[PDB]
Amino acid sequence: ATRHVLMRQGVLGIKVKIMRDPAKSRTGPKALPDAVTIIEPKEEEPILAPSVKDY
Amino acid sequence: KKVYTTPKKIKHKHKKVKLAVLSYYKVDAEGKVTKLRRECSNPTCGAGVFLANHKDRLYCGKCHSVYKVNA
RNA sequence: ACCCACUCGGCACCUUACGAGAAAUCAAAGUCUUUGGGUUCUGGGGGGAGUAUGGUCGCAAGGCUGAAACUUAAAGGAAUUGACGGAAGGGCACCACCAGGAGUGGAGCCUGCGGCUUAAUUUGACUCAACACGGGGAAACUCACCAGGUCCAGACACAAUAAGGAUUGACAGAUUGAGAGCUCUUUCUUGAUUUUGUGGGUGGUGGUGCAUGGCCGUUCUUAGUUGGUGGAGUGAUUUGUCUGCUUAAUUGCGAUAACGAACGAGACCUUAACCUACUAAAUAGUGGUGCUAGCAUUUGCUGGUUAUCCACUUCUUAGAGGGACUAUCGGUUUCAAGCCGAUGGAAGUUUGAGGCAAUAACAGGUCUGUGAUGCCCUUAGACGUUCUGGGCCGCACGCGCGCUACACUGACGGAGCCAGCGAGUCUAACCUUGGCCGAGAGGUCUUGGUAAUCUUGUGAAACUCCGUCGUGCUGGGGAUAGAGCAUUGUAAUUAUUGCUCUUCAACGAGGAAUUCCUAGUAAGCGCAAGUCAUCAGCUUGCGUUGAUUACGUCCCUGCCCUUUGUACACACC
Ligand SMILES: [Mg+2]
Ligand SMILES: [Mg+2]
Ligand SMILES: [Mg+2]
Ligand SMILES: [Mg+2]
Ligand SMILES: [Mg+2]
Ligand SMILES: [Mg+2]
Ligand SMILES: [Mg+2]
Ligand SMILES: [Mg+2]
Ligand SMILES: [Mg+2]
Ligand SMILES: [Mg+2]
Ligand SMILES: [Mg+2]
Ligand SMILES: [Mg+2]
Ligand SMILES: [Mg+2]
Ligand SMILES: [Mg+2]
Ligand SMILES: [Mg+2]
Ligand SMILES: [Mg+2]
Ligand SMILES: [Mg+2]
Ligand SMILES: [Mg+2]
Ligand SMILES: [Mg+2]
Ligand SMILES: [Mg+2]
Ligand SMILES: [Mg+2]
Ligand SMILES: [Mg+2]
Ligand SMILES: [Mg+2]
Ligand SMILES: [Mg+2]
Ligand SMILES: [Mg+2]
Ligand SMILES: [Mg+2]
Ligand SMILES: [Mg+2]
Ligand SMILES: [Mg+2]
Ligand SMILES: [Mg+2]
Ligand SMILES: [Mg+2]
Ligand SMILES: [Mg+2]
Ligand SMILES: [Mg+2]
Ligand SMILES: [Zn+2]
């Protein structure tokens, strides 16, 4: 948003540029196209040679 | 830049005159009153408005330009 | 003579930094506030000045020694980052060439800028990045220009004129372009609303774009900018940000005192390509079924059909999704990023086209878009506003974008007859079918449509096709001009525009130069929209026909990057 402010000498241009948090976006895309999330795997306990449960 | 040319002839506006307007009613002694210069016949005019007398001319001024009636 | 090793004394060189230093750099310029080996010489802000004077040397030019008055806040050293260079070295690009295309420049006319002219020819802009730009196609308007005529729309406060009237208007005539009571003749009207004055406002397409906001153009068809911690430097700073390689790209690969991130790029967004799959549609259609016309008569072919119903979604339309990742493979290369061909595929040039766009530069443009604005100008004999009329179009010429032409791949007459992006009427007079009258322009009576519903399938134009001409400034070309009919509008003369007939110029391919452009592109062709009462030779889009030639390069041109140099830093204006 931009505003002419009027002083004795003249006019000053006001230009404000505000960046609201993408994560909070609510009703619209909630991060940048730049944003690449990876989901973190789990640790694995190997072997446990074949055994079968019975219900 | 450029400025100020005249043929002369600088004018001036309406005069309006003054006098003292209303002496025209003729009041006889004890006590009655006659009215000089008969008034106007239009319905927007209230019988207090007269007709100016020039030549061929008795004309109404309360209705702005309206209805010269010659007598 | 050569070699190898040692050693003195030499001309140098490399690497280092315990040290030094303002730094560049120094094996001395190191052993210095932890200050002392011996000794000679010089200097104590810049200038005045190596000047004056005296002494002395010389043949002379000159050498030596050598002040001060006065003046002045810096001069100055090394290094740093920028800026610039008429320094190199790499690059990048059809606003650059290569190869070619189509031209422009030559001609006619159309328009813009200049000059000239003029009562006025209002004005902004001058290389790219001014000249069909100001949306700038002006008959009034617009208008700012010129010749003239009214108006206050001078808020408000103070003071005065003044209810014995402060002030307003005016019929007819004079007057005026004017049926302007402008002003005057004359004499009614009018009633505290104004008038005169000072102060103060206001209005202005008056000035200043070199006072500013805003917006915009260019650098930029660019690839550039920044910070964490870590390395260097006393420091400003630097490295990260780089030899090479690679991309359109600071895009990456890689190399590596850097590692890992941020903006810009990319991602993103829009539109264009693909959905016999999903959800649907009498404002979209296809099929079937009725109703029906013509021809063949064997059923068939081709149409008409207010919904007459059945059924559907391939066309279409727009919701929802899927698809491409340069995938597969084969080449090549630091077998790295990539690049290359085939295959597959709707699509493989960033899939094509845009939109968006970092910091930084300009005294770039715009007070003539604004009730954005500072200052100055003016403010009532107005630069305000309006009314009347002319002018921006004025024509010995110079320059720019273009339009139409020189024809036979053509003009002309018939004829076949194919789009998309569009837009449209309520306080109306728009998009308009159809029918009637008109050679044409056009008029008139109806009609639907606020529109996927009516205009429209916008039956556009190049074009295809059968002919008339036959290469002759020709039947190519249509300037110029005359006469006649219509149309927009209060108004058309200097002829808004259109038609009809007659007139039939230049131009026989255009000199030096010079622009745009690499694929559904170029170029040819028309349409729709902007503007608009009328007026497109212009623009913004769109489809129709559809190539030749590159797949490269740094030679001209331009610009980016490092290296370099600097006495610039208000930065080569
Ligand atoms: Mg030495
Ligand atoms: Mg000395
Ligand atoms: Mg001194
Ligand atoms: Mg000396
Ligand atoms: Mg000296
Ligand atoms: Mg000397
Ligand atoms: Mg001497
Ligand atoms: Mg001697
Ligand atoms: Mg002597
Ligand atoms: Mg060429
Ligand atoms: Mg142009
Ligand atoms: Mg224009
Ligand atoms: Mg005018
Ligand atoms: Mg004016
Ligand atoms: Mg400027
Ligand atoms: Mg200037
Ligand atoms: Mg640091
Ligand atoms: Mg750092
Ligand atoms: Mg740096
Ligand atoms: Mg980004
Ligand atoms: Mg793109
Ligand atoms: Mg006028
Ligand atoms: Mg003009
Ligand atoms: Mg269509
Ligand atoms: Mg249609
Ligand atoms: Mg002809
Ligand atoms: Mg050129
Ligand atoms: Mg129209
Ligand atoms: Mg219209
Ligand atoms: Mg015109
Ligand atoms: Mg300086
Ligand atoms: Mg100079
Ligand atoms: Zn009357």
Side-chain angles (χ1 to χ4, degrees), chain B residues 6 8-16 19-21 24 37 48-50 52-54 57 59 61-62 64-65:
Chain B
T6 84
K8 193 39 235 181
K9 192 224 292 185
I10 208 189
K11 292 184 184 180
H12 41 276
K13 264 213 168 187
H14 38 271
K15 318 285 212 171
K16 154 76 214 302
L19 200 54
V21 191
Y24 38 87
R37 301 154 147 107
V49 41
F50 311 98
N53 182 42
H54 335 302
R57 270 267 141 110
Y59 141 81
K62 148 73 174 305
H64 38 93
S65 73

Side-chain angles (χ1 to χ4, degrees), chain B residues 23-29 31-37:
Chain B
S23 179
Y24 38 87
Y25 301 88
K26 278 223 157 62
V27 189
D28 319 288
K32 77 222 175 186
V33 167
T34 38
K35 287 182 275 201
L36 289 167
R37 301 154 147 107

Side-chain angles (χ1 to χ4, degrees), chain A residues 10-55:
Chain A
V11 177
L12 303 92
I14 319 290
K15 312 178 185 263
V16 198
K17 189 171 195 174
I18 305 187
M19 174 82 166
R20 93 286 201 290
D21 183 3
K24 307 184 189 186
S25 184
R26 208 162 86 164
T27 330
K30 287 182 182 185
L32 296 316
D34 225 278
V36 161
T37 299
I38 319 297
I39 215 58
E40 202 53 43
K42 210 64 67 207
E43 179 48 41
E44 305 286 62
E45 45 278 87
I47 198 147
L48 241 189
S51 36
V52 45
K53 268 83 181 295
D54 206 330
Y55 303 84

